[PDB]
């Protein structure tokens, strides 16, 4: 037949296999994490094979194996789209997951439920694969909700932490707004096309309208934490560092960008939705970078960097460049996962300390971690020949040479400069200078698991963008001709951010103390958005839920109208009827009145 579909489905099945084995003594013992890691590595190789098959002849297939149910003229069946996006994203996700699982084997060694942690990680991976390979809207929604609820479970890993519980609930709330948008899109598509599958959707929607494309955009914004629905992603750092490295930054937050990429024909057909996507991405990346440049929690800094990169991807989608966004997704997955692993290594070595104000001296204290973090920050800022160069530089060049929003372009450039700035902040406050941690030095990073995982994600932060960009067919016309000052715009702004951040960090050694500014307070407090938008709407909704619906309507007026008024009327009438004194004279006079009335007024 063809070893393409068989091997793709085999990768999915072998991913699903260890979940079945969770009911066995292998799950009861302490070999389960290693078993899961081995399974993930084998899946990574078996997924590399179809990637080699695609890069030769560009083979793309769809498999509709199982027919679920036929709703009259609409057939829902289990269908997989093994196209370029799927066959390119599966190996990257499997590689990152393998590295994160080894890192978690090292990291969550003292956790009593490490087996359950690895089971949850594998379930998240399965749901993400379902989302990526889904061919119809219903299966895509299945994957969407699966990754959402797995994120909910893994954020609140420590059930006894109120902050973890509220972070998980907040993530669920924002993802449910995204799901509202997704359901709007699904309903419109079914109503106006009689199909939930991409083939018929693309065939019939030659000019996709504002309502379905806005539904898709809202779902993508909710999933990728764009402006308005962003705060859940920084708050999602309450979970263990492996969760932040694997789930959010690498593979889950790119779900909205991937969804917008999957509907790039419709996005091309529309213009207003493209403009809205561009503006949303620009404001998101600018705001998140501006918040990042002044944070003291390293995990939060990396989370805001991830949000800024997502905003850049959304900008790339808004300028009608779907494939550059996918390339950036892959490269960002690589170096962001490596950065999160390095931050987790630092945190673990310093006894669960997540403050750069207490980190210091780590350049010589932790050699390999320092090298890996430097390489990751160089790739993040767009070093001219690293993984981030083959995506970010092309994105900036395409934004410059486009009929786009001038404000959006300016905000994108400022966001790149701020990216360089917060990378400088992380490096300076974490590795340079003198120690600020407690005197008991427990620094030890000589674990083979940690070293090997960071090393594997480190070779992929140097030699992966080149291979990927040289092994993919040209899906877009290049921008060969451009002015010299526009060809090096990204480098100039990156160097300016480097220099300004370094100067402002060097000014902290002076024996001068000044109170903070309004701009500093705005930037450090996350723009005051979490405070206002997490206190006012919640208070008003929870107040109207009790004052108006429960007490005023249900407990008072709905009781007053039907049952209480009728009961009172019946009680009063019963009292009036039975209040007779039993006097024969009185009720015989009543008999006489009744007799007269019957005789006279009855004809």
């Amino acid at each position: 037949m063809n070893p393409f579909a068989s091997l793709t489905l085999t990768t999915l099945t072998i991913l699903t296999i260890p979940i079945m084995m969770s009911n066995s003594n292998i799950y009861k013992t302490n070999l389960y994490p290693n078993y899961v890691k081995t399974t993930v590595s084998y899946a990574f190789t078996l997924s590399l094979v179809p990637l080699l098959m695609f890069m030769h002849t560009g083979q793309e297939m769809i498999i509709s194996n199982w027919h679920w149910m036929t709703l009259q003229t609409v057939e829902l069946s289990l269908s997989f789209k093994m196209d370029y996006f799927s066959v390119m994203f599966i190996p990257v996700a499997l590689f990152v997951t393998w590295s994160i699982m080894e890192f978690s084997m090292w990291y969550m060694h003292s956790d009593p439920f490490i087996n359950r942690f690895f089971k949850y990680l594998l379930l998240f991976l399965i749901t993400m694969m379902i989302l990526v390979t889904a061919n119809n809207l219903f299966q895509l929604f299945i994957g969407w909700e699966g990754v959402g609820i797995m994120s909910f479970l893994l954020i609140g890993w420590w059930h006894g932490r109120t902050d973890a519980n509220t972070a998980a609930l907040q993530a669920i709330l924002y993802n449910r707004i995204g799901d509202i948008g997704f359901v709007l899109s699904m309903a419109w598509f079914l109503t106006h096309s009689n199909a939930w599958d991409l083939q018929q959707i693309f065939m019939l929607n030659n000019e996709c309208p504002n309502m379905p494309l806005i539904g898709l955009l809202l779902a993508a914004a909710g999933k990728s934490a764009q402006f308005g629905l962003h705060p859940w992603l920084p708050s999602a750092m309450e979970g263990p560092t492996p969760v932040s490295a694997l789930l959010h930054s690498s593979t889950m937050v790119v779900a909205g960008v991937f969804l917008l990429i999957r509907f790039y024909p419709l996005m091309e057909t529309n213009k207003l939705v493209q403009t809205m996507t561009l503006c949303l991405g620009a404001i998101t990346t600018l705001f998140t970078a501006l918040c990042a440049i002044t944070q003291n929690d390293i995990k939060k800094i990396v989370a805001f960097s991830t949000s800024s990169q997502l905003g850049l991807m959304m900008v790339t989608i808004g300028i009608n460049q779907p494939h550059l966004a996918f390339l950036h997704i892959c490269m960002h997955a690589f170096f962001k996962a490596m950065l999160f692993m390095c931050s987790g290594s630092i945190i673990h070595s310093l006894n669960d300390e997540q403050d750069i104000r207490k980190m210091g001296g780590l350049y010589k204290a932790m050699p390999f971690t320092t090298t890996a973090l430097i390489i990751g920050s160089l790739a993040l800022t767009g070093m001219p020949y690293l993984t981030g160069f083959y995506s970010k530089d092309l994105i900036i060049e395409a934004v410059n040479m486009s009929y786009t929003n001038a404000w959006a372009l300016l905000m994108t450039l400022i966001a790149t400069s701020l990216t360089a700035a917060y990378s400088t902040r992380i490096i300076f406050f974490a590795f340079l200078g003198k120690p600020r941690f407690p005197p008991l030095v427990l620094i030890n990073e000589n674990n083979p698991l940690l070293i090997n995982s960071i090393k594997r994600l480190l070779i992929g932060s140097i030699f992966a963008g080149f291979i990927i960009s040289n092994n993919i067919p040209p899906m877009t016309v290049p921008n060969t001709t451009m002015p010299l000052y526009m060809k090096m715009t990204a480098l100039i702004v990156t160097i300016m951010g480097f220099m300004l951040a370094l100067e402002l960090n060097n000014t902290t050694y002076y024996l001068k103390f000044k109170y903070p500014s309004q701009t500093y307070k705005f930037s450090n407090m996350l723009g005051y958005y979490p405070s206002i938008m997490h206190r006012l709407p919640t208070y008003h909704n929870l107040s109207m839920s009790q004052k108006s619906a429960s007490s005023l309507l249900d407990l008072i007026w709905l009781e007053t109208i039907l049952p209480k008024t009728t009961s009172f009327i019946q009680m009063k009438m019963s009292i009036m009827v039975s209040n007779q004194k039993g006097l024969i004279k009185l009720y015989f006079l009543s008999f006489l009145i009744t007799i007269m009335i019957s005789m006279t007024l009855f004809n």
Partner: protein, 459 residues
């Protein structure tokens, strides 16, 4: 249908002639056997129903409800075993007799072929439920709950009886097949408006509809566990089945009279979800969630499109199973601590892991996690409502968000956090309780695997 009806009327003498320590075993075993026998009704045709005789017939809408009732009886028996340890033999046999009579009446109601017999049985179901509530409830408010339940139902249903006898006199027969084939349009006059009001209002009070729903929290909070299980899962579906049956003769007047009820149902979804957000009682939370789901089913039935009836049936079955499971979990927690306050007991995930897993699964099914039949029905209803109008999508989206909010809120409140220090009577979960939860949850996933069996006759 006699092959299913007679075994229940044999459950009665078996229960009354069994030994004192074997009543539960015999009742459970033979209820399971009757459920297995009733599974054969799922082999429905594609064009016309199964007409066994002049009195009983089975359809693609009746069969899943009959299977649900026959499956729900043994679970109620297990819960009764749980909470009726110290009762006397005669009172235990009376409780089992009430459950058996209720199941028999429900089976005959679902398989009745005429509207008057349907009404007679659908009103006959009131007596066992009222007796169970007002006799084996635990708190003082059970008498008030029984009064509210009985009088709401009767005030709803008496004009239905008047309308039914009037319809028979006018047309000739109340047989469903005849009134479907010989159906004629209903003119827009005051008399037709009031006949429509009689029938629809009866079934809406039974449903319930927002504004006519206080009896539901009153009865479900104060009823015993078996009463709550049967009230939420099956007795609420009598209104939906009746509306899906009675609307054949109400067109095209239904296209004009549906607006007040549609607005009431949608705003009631919103209001009851918001009420669920701020409830200090777990059973009240579950009851109001049931109200919201039934309001969604009302919206589907009133918009009355082929994609809305399938969603209505799927949502009815899924909600019945989910609400029964939630009530069972809440009853286990109550029996451990003897209080219905939600914030009284915490850390139950630390103290009882498997019950935490059951709570997680039940709450995930409640918030319509794909590809569960809850989500299937809700999505079909949402798509039909979107075709009807394009702001129903806004209302459904906000309702879905609040539903997820309160489901995860109750999960986090009960299971997560620091355990209460002074509560030291949390014994390990019983095999009976674990098996009850498993028997509640597995059929949901199996119906997810095979969804065409619960999508009604319009599939």
């Amino acid at each position: 249908m006699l092959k299913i009806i007679i075994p229940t009327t044999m459950l009665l003498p078996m229960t009354w002639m069994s030994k004192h320590n074997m009543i539960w075993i015999n009742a459970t075993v033979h209820s399971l056997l009757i459920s297995l026998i009733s599974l054969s009704l799922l082999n429905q045709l594609g064009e016309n129903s199964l007409n066994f005789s002049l009195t009983f017939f089975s359809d693609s809408l009746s069969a899943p409800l009959l299977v649900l009732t026959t499956w729900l009886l043994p679970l109620m028996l297990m819960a009764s075993q749980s909470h009726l340890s110290k009762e006397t033999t005669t009172r235990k046999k009376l409780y089992i007799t009430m459950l058996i009579l209720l199941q028999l009446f429900l089976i005959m109601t679902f398989t009745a072929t005429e509207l008057i017999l349907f009404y007679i049985l659908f009103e006959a179901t009131l007596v066992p439920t009222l007796i169970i509530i007002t006799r084996w409830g635990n708190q003082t408010e059970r008498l008030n709950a029984g009064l509210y339940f009985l009088f709401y139902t009767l005030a709803g249903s008496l004009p239905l009886l008047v309308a039914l006898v009037y319809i028979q006199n006018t047309t000739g027969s109340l047989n469903f097949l005849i009134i479907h084939y010989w159906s004629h349009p209903l003119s827009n006059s005051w008399s037709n408006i009031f006949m429509w009001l009689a029938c629809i209002m009866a079934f809406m009070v039974k449903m319930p509809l927002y504004g006519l729903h206080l009896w539901l929290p009153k009865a479900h909070v104060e009823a015993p566990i078996a009463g709550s299980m049967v009230l939420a899962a099956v007795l609420l579906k009598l209104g939906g089945y009746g509306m899906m049956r009675i609307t054949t003769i109400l067109n095209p007047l239904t296209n004009y009279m549906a607006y007040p009820f549609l607005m009431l149902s949608m705003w009631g979804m919103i209001m009851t979800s918001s009420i669920c957000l701020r409830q200090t009682d777990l059973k009240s939370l579950i009851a109001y969630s049931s109200v919201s789901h039934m309001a969604l089913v009302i919206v589907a039935i009133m918009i009355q499109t082929p994609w809305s009836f399938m969603g209505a049936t799927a949502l009815m079955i899924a909600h019945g199973l989910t609400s029964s499971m939630l009530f069972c979990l809440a009853n286990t927690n109550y029996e451990r601590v003897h209080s219905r306050t939600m914030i009284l007991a915490r850390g139950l995930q630390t103290l009882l892991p498997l019950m935490a897993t059951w709570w997680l699964v039940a709450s995930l099914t409640n918030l319509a996690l794909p590809p569960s039949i809850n989500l299937i029905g809700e999505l079909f209803i949402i798509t039909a409502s979107f075709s009807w109008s394009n702001i129903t999508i806004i209302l459904m989206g906000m309702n879905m968000m609040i539903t997820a909010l309160y489901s995860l809120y109750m999960l986090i409140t009960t299971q997560r956090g620091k355990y209460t220090h002074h509560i030291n009577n949390i014994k390990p979960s019983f095999t009976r309780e674990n098996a009850l939860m498993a028997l509640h949850i597995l059929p949901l996933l199996l119906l997810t695997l095979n969804p065409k069996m619960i999508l009604g006759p319009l599939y």
